[PDB]
């Protein structure tokens, strides 16, 4: 059994950062050094565990989260960050044990007039909790009077698009991000290195 990283990394379309995908990966043998030596990634940062050791460690379950952001926000995908991604879209815990991979995708996820398929939650009542997900589009109430699903002053549609374009800056260009998480639970280990 070989862990199915091939359709997680090389998926034809990634999600948005508010409605991010997850995938459970169990009962398989994964070689992490073959990923680390792809060298086609802008960012490969492992927290809580050192690479070159992932083949010598064995975990109950691992999870692969996939989402697209802009280049300047990959700094926010990390333990202890703060922003409009670490608070409202994707939050990583202080006890993270995994690896954040990220790579430029201006070829696939950008269009001449703009690509409005990729969204992010701009306003939210409170900060996300570690690994929580929020896909509601309820009108955000910014004042004292309720917003019964109708827009106006004081009431905002919370999501908003990135509007990727082929010639945006390098910090405003699409970046595909895959967060691998490893869990050590009191149970037989199923996903394990070679």
């Amino acid at each position, epitope marked *: 059994n070989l862990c199915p990283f091939g359709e997680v990394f090389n998926a034809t379309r990634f999600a948005s950062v508010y409605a991010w995908n997850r995938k459970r990966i169990s009962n398989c043998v994964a070689d992490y050094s073959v990923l680390y030596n792809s060298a086609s990634f802008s960012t490969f940062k492992c927290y809580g565990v050192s690479p070159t050791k992932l083949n010598d460690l064995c975990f109950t379950n691992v999870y692969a989260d996939s989402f697209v952001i802009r*280049g*300047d926000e990959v700094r926010q995908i990390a333990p202890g960050q703060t922003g409009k991604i670490a608070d409202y879209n994707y939050k990583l815990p202080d006890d993270f044990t995994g690896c954040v991979i990220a790579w*430029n995708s*201006n070829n696939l996820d950008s269009k001449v007039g703009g690509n409005y398929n990729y969204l992010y939650r701009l306003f939210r009542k409170s900060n996300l909790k570690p690994f929580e997900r929020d896909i509601s589009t309820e009108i955000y109430q910014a004042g004292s009077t309720p917003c019964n699903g109708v827009e106006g002053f004081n009431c905002y549609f919370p999501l908003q698009s990135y509007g990727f374009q*082929p*010639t945006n*800056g*390098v*910090g405003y260009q699409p970046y595909r991000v895959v967060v691998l998480s490893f869990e050590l639970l009191h149970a037989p280990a199923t996903v394990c290195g070679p």
Partner: antibody
Framework: VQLVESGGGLVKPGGSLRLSCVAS????????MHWVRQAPGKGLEWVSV????????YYADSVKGRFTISRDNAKNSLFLQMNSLRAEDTAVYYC????????????????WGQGVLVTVSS | DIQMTQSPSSLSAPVGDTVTITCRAS??????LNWFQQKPGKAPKLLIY???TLESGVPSRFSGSGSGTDFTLTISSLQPEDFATYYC?????????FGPGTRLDIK
């Protein structure tokens, strides 16, 4: 309007070398900063780029892993640290800039710098 | 990585004529080509900051044209200041690639 570099010189292969590009006459944070090197062989070579905030850095195929670009907006400075130099890294280095309108980058490489010289020999 | 191949490598022309240079690309780019002129020992100069548009301060002699893969640069009136080496830069995808260059001399 003034992009002036420093830090070049002669180094034996394997060593470190940190070039600098002071920029005056414009708001530094409005611009995306690129490095372009040219060896005595005819042809310009794009090296690296850093964004207005320093959050995203991109490197060429040849110089990735060794050279690291950085910028300090306070001191209007743009640095390029070079580790593990080699013989093919002897070139004239120019710091150039691109303007960020709102999210788009247009008028690419508007002005250039003076251009330091980096020679690598024993 | 997008490869660019300028068709002229070195061409000479007398003063008072017009020259034309080509900068073809492999992957189609949608009008994302900055032309540059370099003088020996000096930093290059931006000439045409799109497929067509002229940069502020460049004489009205130069004229970019084309989009997609096959671009073109025309130099209307040749001068002593015209002769230099011309490069072309694509900024569609981020590992930007200049061209190999084109040297221009007086016939």
């Amino acid at each position: 309007v003034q992009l002036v570099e420093s830090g070049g010189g002669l180094v034996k292969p394997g060593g470190s070398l940190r070039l600098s590009c002071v920029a005056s006459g414009f708001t530094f944070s409005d611009y995306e900063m690129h490095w372009v090197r040219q060896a005595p062989g005819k042809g310009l070579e794009w090296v690296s780029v850093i964004s207005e905030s320093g959050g995203t850095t991109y490197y060429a195929d040849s110089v990735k892993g060794r050279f690291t670009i950085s910028r300090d907006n306070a001191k209007n400075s743009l640095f390029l640290q070079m580790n593990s130099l080699r013989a093919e890294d002897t070139a004239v280095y120019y710091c150039t800039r691109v303007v960020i309108v709102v999210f788009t980058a247009m008028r690419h490489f508007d002005y250039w710098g003076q251009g330091v010289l980096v020679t690598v020999s024993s | 990585d997008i490869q660019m191949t300028q068709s002229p490598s070195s061409l000479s022309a007398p003063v008072g004529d017009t020259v034309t240079i080509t900068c073809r690309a492999s992957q189609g780019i949608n009008s994302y080509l900055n032309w540059f002129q370099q003088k020996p020992g000096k930093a290059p100069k931006l000439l045409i900051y799109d497929a067509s548009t002229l940069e502020s301060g460049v004489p009205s002699r130069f004229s970019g044209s084309g989009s997609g893969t096959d671009f073109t640069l025309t130099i209307s009136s040749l001068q002593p200041e015209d002769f230099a080496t011309y490069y072309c830069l694509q900024y569609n995808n981020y590992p930007f690639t200049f061209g190999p260059g084109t040297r221009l001399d007086i016939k």
